[PDB]
Structure 1
Amino acid sequence: ATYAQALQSVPETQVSQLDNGLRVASEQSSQPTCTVGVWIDAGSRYETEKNNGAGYFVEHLAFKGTKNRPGNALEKEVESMGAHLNAYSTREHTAYYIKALSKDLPKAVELLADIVQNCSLEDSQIEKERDVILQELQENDTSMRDVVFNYLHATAFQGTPLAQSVEGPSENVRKLSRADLTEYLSRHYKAPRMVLAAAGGLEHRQLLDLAQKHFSGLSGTYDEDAVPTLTPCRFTGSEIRHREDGLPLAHVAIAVEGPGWANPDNVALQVANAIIGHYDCTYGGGMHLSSPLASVAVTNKLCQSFQTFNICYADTGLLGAHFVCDHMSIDDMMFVLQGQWMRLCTSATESEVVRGKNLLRNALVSHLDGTTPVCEDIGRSLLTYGRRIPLAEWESRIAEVDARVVREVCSKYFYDQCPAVAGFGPIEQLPDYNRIRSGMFWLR
């Protein structure tokens, strides 16, 4: 019992500041399994046109040999102690992390330091990995949901560098030199911006001392003060439609403005997307789901799937919906989705907000379990928010939100906004832009 009192039984993340400027943070939790990770603010947003896709290429060549343990000895030690190496990169973040055991922590931090600060590139490496990325683009031209997200960011952040792709275009990939790689490595693998964070059964002193013995000596000064700095860009609102009829299903992504990070409208719109949420076509209780979009869509056989969702970047983002449906069903699914949005805008009752609170709490707690997602929580917390936000804070911000504030926020950020439609597939029936906009503001 006493769910709030049980939420006070959650440990706190120690935050400390290595003398290079490096943010280190640890959550000593109650398990023999540890996750140690590095989160780096070097996405794709910090790039030129000619450095497009350099970061993806770096992440490929992050694990392929260094000046210290050349060639494959990195991987050999990983498979020696049975380490579990993993990495990902987004448009705004880039992370390398390691799932391992409570006792190999000095050797794992040695591995991670040799990944980051001593990455070295070679000619056989650059040629072979250029061939590898040509294989990966040519075999992920057909990853359809990825193509839809590419189109959505490209059409909603036109002109600004946020519309660049994570891999870069092909004609910036097949001609990169090592010099531009070294420039990117030099200009974005810097000490103060990045976070070393561990989550598991280990004390903060051990982590601080190992970071002192290895991360003393990466960086701290730029190449003649060529400081990368954010620009709060502009959300255009448009549609790009890729008519390609030889495909079985059609994908639609509809999106509007992102609220940002530090505003609490972040949390309230996450409550609205808890109400709307996601349906996939493989459920039980299909005729009786509480989510009204999925209830109408199942009973009238509209869509294969939807996820109705949030994405935030620095002072911006895409608040939106994705749905996949058959080429003779797009219009009515579209109509019911705008109907759900406007019903939340003007006629938000109380019980549906209570259901949103239940869904958001359960999704938040279920997302924050397992050592590695909690370490990713801490990494994105100390990057964006600049602190590990506690979950009693999330309890406070949930309890400080009722039906009135929800319909206020959705009247602000949805009602008669200029959307962005990225449609891919057989979408000749997908309605024209003016009737989407006329479906936004509704007279009735």
Structure 2
Amino acid sequence: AEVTQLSNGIVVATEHNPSAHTASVGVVFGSGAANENPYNNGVSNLWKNIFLSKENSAVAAKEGLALSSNISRDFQSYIVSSLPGSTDKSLDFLNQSFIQQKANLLSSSNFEATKKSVLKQVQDFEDNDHPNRVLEHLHSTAFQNTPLSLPTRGTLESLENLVVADLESFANNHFLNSNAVVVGTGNIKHEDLVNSIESKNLSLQTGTKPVLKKKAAFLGSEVRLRDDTLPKAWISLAVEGEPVNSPNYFVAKLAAQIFGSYNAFEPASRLQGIKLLDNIQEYQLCDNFNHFSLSYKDSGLWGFSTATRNVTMIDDLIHFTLKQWNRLTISVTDTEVERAKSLLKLQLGQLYESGNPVNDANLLGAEVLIKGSKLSLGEAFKKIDAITVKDVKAWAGKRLWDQDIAIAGTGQIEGLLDYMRIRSDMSMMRW
């Protein structure tokens, strides 16, 4: 439970844990899909793919190292996992790929083979992963003509028109030192890693800063991807949520826990202490749903996603769900809040403390890049337990009550009513 972070020439962040069996090392840059353009959209995802290319991956496999990368909206990460003893050989492969081979990975035979793979990759996503496809379009319409609208995997049209030069241009503008953080998770000590880093000098493009842009903004709107050939309807609906480092960061996440997630086929899920379940189970309004409180640097999204085969009652699904959310402003109970606290801790714990260091790296990296530090799991619980019904009400009355929404859906959505009908349900009539 130690969050150590020091700065020499580069900012080093680590979180050591005795028993772990393995150690993960990697660099996390403060720029992701939110930094791209509509035309070079997908460059970051492309970088990730060559970094994991058969060539670069085989070089690490001989050495007994495993590679992992993750492209997000606000950040980007390249991670190498190793045994606690080879904590130095991971750094050799890291530097060898970001300075030495930052020209060998970009060969005309490797690039074309990779491009052909991310194309079949992004295509497969759009053709079959409907729930994530819908969630991606939700960001697209909610944050249209703004940084958060760009999809992480990039679009097919911007991808196929991408060249080696675009990779370089992005790398020379974002893979900078002032826009990076070296992260180490597993079991290795902070002093053990910082020494191996401060050993090898050479700045390489120091003092250089990444380009600036315009602030992200939420726009109440919708995108309907109707497709009657699909056997279900997948929808996602949300309001402007909370950005990371917001006073209500936790109040929002708790609010989403109150309604939680559901799976009609799992006996135990049908028994949860969620009032909404009394309404949706009678006629089986859906196969599943899940609420979320997505947070990013400039903004976020609070809402839910759902999947259903009850195509003639989608209006009841949306109506009952929105009536429940109305409650947060006027009648949420003490016990609902308390149930949420307990469940929020359990989920927040299971995330922050998993038996996998690669997840730890992403969580640590993403946090330190935005606030310059990481809030300890024990510190979070103190904030969570401090939330009162009055807090949730004040939050809901500002973020949910009579506020614009963003909608996205695909499949048999003929039954999903017009925007104004959904929007009207964001409140209730009163004397």
* Common fold by TM > 0.5: yes
Match of 1:7 in 2: none
1:92 to 71, 74, 94: 74
Number of the residue aligned with 2:46: 57
CA distance in 2, matches of 1:84, 1:208: 21
- Cα displacement string for residues 78-123 of structure 1 (whole angstroms, at most 9, x for unaligned residues): 3234322111101221111123210011101111222334422111
Alignment of 1:232-251 (within 5 A): 232-251=215-234
Q: Distance between the aligned counterparts of 1:240 and 1:422, measured in 2?
A: 5
Superposed CA deviations along residues 353-383 of structure 1, whole A, max 9, x for unmatched, are 1111101111111212223333322112201
Alignment of 1:322-401 (within 5 A): 322-326=305-309, 327-369=311-353, 370=355, 371-401=357-387
Corresponding residue for 2:116?
A: 131
Q: Determine if contact 1:286/1:298 at 8 Å carries over to the other structure.
A: no
TM-score, normalised with respect to structure 1: 0.90
Residues 1:183 and 2:166 are matched in the alignment:
no
The question of 1:297 aligning with 2:280 is answered yes
Cα separation, 2, equivalents of 1:385 and 1:263: 11
Q: Say if 2:16 and 2:188, in contact at 8 Å, map to a contact too.
A: yes
* Residue matched to 1:18: 8
State yes or no: 1:312 paired with 2:301: no
SS in 1 for 2:52: coil
Q: Is the 8 A contact 2:402 2:427 kept in 1?
A: yes
Say whether the 8 Å CA contact 1:249–1:325 is kept in structure 2.
yes
For residues 62 and 148 of structure 2, what CA distance do their matches in structure 1 show? 40
| 8 Å CA contact 1:288, 1:295 repeated in 2 | no
Q: Please give the alpha-carbon distance, in whole angstroms, between the structure 1 residues aligned to 2:247 and 2:204.
A: 36
Offset at residue 249 of structure 1 (A): 0.5
Q: Decide whether the 8 Å contact of 2:122 with 2:155 is kept in 1.
A: no
2:271 pairs with 265, 288, 299, which one?
288
Separation in structure 1 between the aligned mates of residue 393 and residue 8 of structure 2, nearest angstrom: 45
Q: Secondary structure at the match of 2:234?
A: strand
* Equivalent position of 2:107 in the other structure: 122
Once the two structures are overlaid, the 10-residue window that deviates more, 286-295 or 305-314, is: 286-295
Instruction: Check whether the contact 1:113–1:214 (CA below 8 A) recurs between aligned residues.
Output: no
Question: 1:366 and 1:431, CA in 2 relative to 1: closer, same or farther beyond 3 A?
Answer: same
Aligned: 1:221 with 2:204: no
Q: Residues 216, 136 of structure 1: CA spacing in aligned structure 2 closer, same or farther, 3 A cutoff?
A: same
SS at match of 2:46: helix
Shift of 1:57: 1.4
Indicate if the aligned counterparts of 1:306 and 1:321 stay in contact, CA closer than 8 A. Answer: yes
Structure 2 segments unaligned to the other structure (5+ residues): none
1:153-201 residue CA offsets vs partner (Å, 9 max, x unmatched):
1111122243222233323222222222211110010012211111222
Paired residue for 2:160, among 169, 174, 179?
A: 174
Compared CA separation, residues 442 and 265, structure 1 to 2 (3 A): same
Aligned-partner Cα distance in 1 for 2:92–2:49: 20
Contact 2:17 2:188 (C-alpha < 8 Å) held by counterparts: yes
Check if 1:75 corresponds to 2:57.
yes
Aligned to 2:246: 263
1:203 aligns with 2:189: yes
Between the aligned partners of 1:442 and 1:325, the Cα distance in structure 2 is 26
Tell me the matched-pair count: 422
Please list every run of at least 4 consecutive aligned residues from structure 1 whose deviation after the TM superposition is greater than 4 angstroms. none
The secondary structure found in structure 1 opposite 2:153 is coil
Larger deviation: 383-392 or 244-253? Answer: 383-392
What's 2:35 paired with? 46
SS of structure 2 residue aligned to 1:190: coil
Residue 140 of structure 2 corresponds to which residue in structure 1? 154
CA shift for structure 1 position 129? 1.9
Residues 39 and 195 in structure 1, CA contact (< 8 A), matched pair in contact too: yes
Instruction: Give the Cα–Cα distance (whole angstroms) in 1 for the partners of residues 187 and 147 of structure 2.
Output: 41
Identity of aligned residues (%): 28
| Contact 1:286/1:295 (8 A) holds in 2 | no
**Which letter does structure 2 place at the counterpart of 1:87?**
S
| Alpha-carbon separation, structure 1, partners of 2:264 and 2:60 | 40
Structure 1 residues 177 and 117, CA gap change in structure 2 (3 angstroms): same
Q: Does the CA-based 8 Å contact 1:242-1:424 persist in structure 2?
A: yes
Give the superposition deviation at 1:316.
Answer: 0.8
- Please, which runs of 5 or more residues in structure 1 have no aligned partner? 1-10, 65-70
Return the alpha-carbon distance in structure 2 between the equivalents of residues 145 and 286 of structure 1.
Answer: 20
CA distance in 2, matches of 1:252, 1:438: 18
**Amino acid aligned to 1:23:** V
